[PDB]
Amino acid sequence: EATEIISTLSNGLIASHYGVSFFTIQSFVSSLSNTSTLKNMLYVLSTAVEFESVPLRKGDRALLVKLSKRLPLRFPEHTSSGSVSFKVFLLLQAYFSRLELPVDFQNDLKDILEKVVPLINVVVDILSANGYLNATTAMDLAQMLIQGVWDVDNPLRQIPHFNNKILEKCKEINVETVYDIMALEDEERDEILTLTDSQLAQVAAFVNNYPNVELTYSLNNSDSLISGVKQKITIQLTRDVEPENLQVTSEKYPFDKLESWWLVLGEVSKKELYAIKKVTLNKETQQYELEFDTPTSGKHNLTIWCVCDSYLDADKELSFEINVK
């Protein structure tokens, strides 16, 4: 027999509550810019003073140098590797890559994960407050921190027990998303799901609560927009079924997490963000109002993004043209 027990799949431990220090906000503001990349953001995260509670032991540096050869993002070459920053930057990548770690590093990684959610939210808030569209790259990193995968990974890799053998069976029959899994016929699905009932229970918890949302909008008085006037927009989000709750299912993240979304209005050609609201989609249908400053006269192609903070590949977007008088 030997059932693999995963007690924190859907029943997370409670992460110790804290508020990010003003010192850390200052440091992040100094280091971030409108051109910051995913690599830059992961490095900045790693420099938080809050990680001073993460141990560094005799011999760790040499183990981390060995580990660095196996990871895709390079630590800044002009920067001391004798810091806890080096450890955090490398262990978070080992988490995304799902590499095997010795026990002491597994322990350290748990301690690191306890702190990451408030920190990545500060990154999103710094970038968005300044109107930088790269806030969306920070949101991608937020999703990676919850599911323990890379932004570029096969989205099916989030599903418990979906190993490389199962992924290739999915490729064989053009199954690409979690939604594709559920739209299949019984014989096709049964063939892919060559797992024990215990393993299937864990697949089920994930599929049950994976979000499927529909995005729509209405612009108050679209045919009469005036430059510099505060303008309201209504954004509506609908689910096919009202969710039982918003507890996140994550195999790799061991703490309790509640599902949240960012609603974003922006302009891609200008790399500009115009409005942002953090919301919880607890009902079968819901609508929200965002306020923004009407852009300059002329044509503008805008986009609304709905981006989840807890899963990959469930995001939605809509683009529309406005003509400011």
Side-chain angles (χ1 to χ4, degrees):
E1 217 266 346
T3 296
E4 182 182 344
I5 297 170
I6 309 173
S7 68
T8 57
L9 180 62
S10 300
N11 297 254
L13 309 175
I14 295 94
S16 183
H17 167 80
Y18 80 104
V20 178
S21 72
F22 185 64
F23 188 86
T24 292
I25 295 171
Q26 290 185 98
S27 183
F28 281 16
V29 166
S30 189
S31 293
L32 292 163
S33 78
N34 59 12
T35 59
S36 293
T37 65
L38 181 78
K39 181 172 75 172
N40 296 154
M41 299 173 195
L42 182 63
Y43 175 69
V44 170
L45 188 162
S46 84
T47 69
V49 75
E50 285 81 10
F51 291 128
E52 64 195 316
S53 64
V54 180
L56 285 169
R57 310 179 193 82
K58 190 161 283 258
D60 280 3
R61 183 167 189 182
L63 292 173
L64 291 163
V65 174
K66 283 177 194 266
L67 190 57
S68 74
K69 309 300 182 182
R70 306 171 60 199
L71 297 164
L73 309 177
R74 218 93 83 112
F75 192 75
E77 70 276 50
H78 47 87
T79 302
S80 175
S81 60
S83 57
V84 76
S85 174
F86 190 61
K87 174 176 272 192
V88 177
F89 184 77
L90 297 174
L91 296 188
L92 282 171
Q93 291 189 71
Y95 174 72
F96 306 142
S97 291
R98 303 180 170 201
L99 305 188
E100 299 279 342
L101 291 172
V103 167
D104 283 339
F105 285 172
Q106 293 180 355
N107 287 344
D108 297 338
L109 177 59
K110 186 168 156 53
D111 288 342
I112 289 162
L113 292 172
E114 199 174 10
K115 293 181 187 285
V116 299
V117 165
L119 292 169
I120 195 60
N121 277 281
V122 164
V123 176
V124 174
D125 287 354
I126 291 170
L127 299 168
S128 62
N130 285 283
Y132 304 154
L133 194 48
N134 69 349
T136 62
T137 294
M139 297 176 186
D140 288 342
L141 183 53
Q143 299 176 349
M144 287 166 53
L145 288 165
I146 303 304
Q147 296 291 336
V149 295
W150 288 96
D151 61 338
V152 295
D153 266 325
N154 186 324
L156 301 174
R157 197 177 295 281
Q158 296 169 97
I159 308 177
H161 312 293
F162 270 52
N163 58 37
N164 293 340
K165 168 66 182 173
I166 289 177
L167 294 176
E168 55 162 34
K169 285 198 271 86
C170 289
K171 183 184 174 59
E172 284 174 38
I173 58 160
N174 306 129
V175 167
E176 290 181 18
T177 68
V178 185
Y179 313 128
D180 291 337
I181 296 286
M182 292 325 289
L184 286 171
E185 217 65 43
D186 287 352
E187 68 257 308
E188 293 166 306
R189 180 190 39 67
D190 288 10
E191 180 60 75
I192 291 168
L193 292 185
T194 51
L195 297 166
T196 69
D197 293 343
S198 289
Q199 292 174 318
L200 294 180
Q202 298 165 329
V203 174
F206 187 87
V207 172
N208 279 179
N209 277 13
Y210 187 80
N212 192 355
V213 304
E214 286 297 307
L215 179 67
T216 55
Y217 86 102
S218 56
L219 190 47
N220 276 223
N221 52 301
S222 53
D223 289 26
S224 280
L225 302 174
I226 304 282
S227 190
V229 178
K230 57 265 92 234
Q231 179 63 45
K232 272 154 253 64
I233 191 165
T234 306
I235 302 175
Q236 172 181 304
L237 288 124
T238 68
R239 292 201 193 239
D240 217 306
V241 173
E242 199 209 77
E244 43 177 310
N245 57 66
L246 304 172
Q247 286 290 350
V248 172
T249 303
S250 170
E251 179 182 355
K252 300 298 179 177
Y253 183 74
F255 303 103
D256 230 72
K257 179 81 185 77
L258 293 169
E259 184 191 293
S260 187
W261 296 72
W262 297 276
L263 275 31
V264 185
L265 178 74
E267 196 177 352
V268 172
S269 72
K270 304 197 80 158
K271 315 213 201 297
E272 187 154 42
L273 189 154
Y274 294 133
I276 189 167
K277 194 180 177 62
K278 188 179 295 166
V279 299
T280 64
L281 305 183
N282 59 316
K283 300 198 197 66
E284 203 184 294
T285 185
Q286 50 263 294
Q287 54 182 263
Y288 303 97
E289 204 167 77
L290 300 192
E291 177 206 0
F292 61 105
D293 290 313
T294 310
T296 53
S297 306
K299 70 178 226 161
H300 301 267
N301 293 118
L302 307 185
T303 306
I304 294 162
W305 300 269
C306 195
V307 178
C308 186
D309 80 343
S310 293
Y311 300 99
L312 290 84
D313 207 42
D315 308 328
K316 298 288 168 64
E317 66 177 84
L318 208 152
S319 291
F320 64 94
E321 196 190 80
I322 65 165
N323 232 276
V324 184
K325 254 94 183 165

